Write a protein that binds this ligand. Structure first.
Ligand SMILES: NCc1ccc(-c2cccc(F)c2)c(Cl)c1
Ligand SMILES: NCc1ccc(-c2cccc(F)c2)c(Cl)c1
Ligand SMILES: NCc1ccc(-c2cccc(F)c2)c(Cl)c1
Ligand SMILES: NCc1ccc(-c2cccc(F)c2)c(Cl)c1
Ligand SMILES: NCc1ccc(-c2cccc(F)c2)c(Cl)c1
Ligand SMILES: NCc1ccc(-c2cccc(F)c2)c(Cl)c1
Length: 327
């Protein structure tokens, strides 16, 4: 069977912290007053929640209210516990309150408001310096949450709120986040298709924080190469073939052989043989202003099949790509 794996960092955070920290099922929710909030506009709806812009009438402050749907409702304690554990962390969305929505009969999470700039608008105008700057801010959030024994598991552009005017960034939607326990087998049906790490795509369940580092690398490749998404799979199987057309099939086979993983036999008819491509292949006259030798070297160290080989968030912050960023 599969060879076991452990994170190379923050391995034993959850064992040396008290049980009340990670045992989210034993957590007693403190309920706030639903009457303090006035819903103003529905921002959106997903399969797990409905999100609104609201006003806290006890201080006139704008807030965001996330009304959880019943599917999400069953696992709210994990999300609430994670949010409380991470509250005050750098660039982590702040949970302000938890109320019972009288219509949905489900919990509603109230968050600080972030005046999010449109994804298309921001994607199109970010300079080389702004990419580096915001990547560094995302790394602060990821090293903080990994240091706290938590993996996000859904890093993607829609989960990163940016108020470009105030250069404020927040990592949101901790609904898929989980506590890392060494040797635990996790569900591989996490993260959005284009951001899924190879470990999910080959059904390797003993993954860790390094999954977030793959997803971060996919975001970086899209922004510096102006190719959205970078790995554009039609389904989860084609997602792996898209990765293999860039990183190559030999390094893929080295990875699955290292962990004694067998690919789904359906790959025989779609995977083929592909050499590893040099990152410079993706440079052209329309993205050259966002690329540098430091960007390519940094991307190379995130987008690695072997989850144990990827840079950690703290090592990533040490990289020359961020030397230009004012700290
Ligand atoms: N308070 C507005 C509202 C009302 C109902 C629901 C809801 C409840 C049960 C199932 C479901 F799919 C949605 C939500 Cl999330 C928000
Ligand atoms: N451009 C209007 C807008 C305003 C707020 C939000 C928002 C949603 C959830 C959490 C959050 F911190 C902010 C979005 Cl997505 C769009
Ligand atoms: N939710 C809008 C959004 C979130 C994040 C980013 C982003 C992603 C990678 C690097 C970076 F500097 C910024 C963009 Cl462009 C838009
Ligand atoms: N108003 C456009 C819009 C719609 C949806 C999302 C979205 C999608 C998935 C997860 C998430 F946290 C947010 C965003 Cl960021 C903006
Ligand atoms: N994919 C062909 C390609 C095209 C141009 C460049 C390039 C762009 C700007 C400066 C520079 F020193 C080189 C590279 Cl690296 C690769
Ligand atoms: N921003 C202009 C630019 C773009 C790309 C490169 C480049 C060229 C070859 C390899 C490499 F890793 C990066 C340079 Cl030197 C300058």
């Amino acid at each position: 069977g599969p060879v076991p794996s452990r994170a190379r960092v923050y391995t034993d955070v959850n064992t040396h912290r008290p049980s009340e920290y990670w045992d989210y099922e034993s957590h007693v929710v403190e309920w706030g007053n639903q009457d303090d909030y006035q819903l103003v506009r529905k921002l959106g709806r997903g399969k797990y929640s409905e999100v609104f812009e609201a006003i806290n009438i006890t201080n006139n402050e704008k807030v965001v209210v996330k009304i959880l749907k019943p599917v999400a409702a069953a696992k709210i304690k994990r999300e609430i516990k994670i949010l409380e554990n991470l509250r005050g962390g750098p660039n982590i969305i702040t949970l302000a309150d938890i109320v019972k929505d009288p219509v949905s009969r489900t919990p509603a999470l109230v968050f600080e408001h972030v005046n999010n700039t449109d994804f298309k608008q921001l994607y199109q105008t970010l300079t080389d310096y702004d990419i580096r700057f915001y990547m560094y801010e995302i790394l602060k959030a990821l090293d903080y949450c990994h240091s706290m024994g938590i993996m996000h598991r859904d890093v993607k552009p829609h989960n990163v709120m940016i108020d470009h005017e105030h250069r404020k960034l927040r990592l949101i939607d901790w609904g898929l986040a989980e506590f890392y326990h060494p040797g635990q087998e996790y569900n591989v049906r996490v993260a959005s298709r284009y951001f899924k790490g190879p470990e999910l795509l080959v059904d390797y369940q003993m993954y860790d924080y390094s999954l977030d580092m793959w997803s971060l690398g996919c975001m970086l490749a899209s922004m510096i190469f102006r190719k959205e998404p970078f790995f554009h799979g039609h389904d989860n199987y084609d997602q792996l073939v898209r990765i293999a057309k860039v990183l190559g099939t030999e390094d893929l086979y080295d990875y699955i052989d290292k962990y004694n993983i067998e690919l789904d036999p359906r790959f025989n008819d779609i995977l083929g043989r592909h050499s590893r491509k040099r990152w410079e292949r993706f440079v052209h006259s329309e993205n050259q202003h966002l690329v540098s030798p430091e960007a390519l070297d940094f991307l190379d160290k995130l987008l690695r099949y072997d989850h144990q080989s990827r840079l950690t968030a703290r090592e990533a912050m040490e990289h020359p790509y961020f030397y230009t960023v004012v700290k």
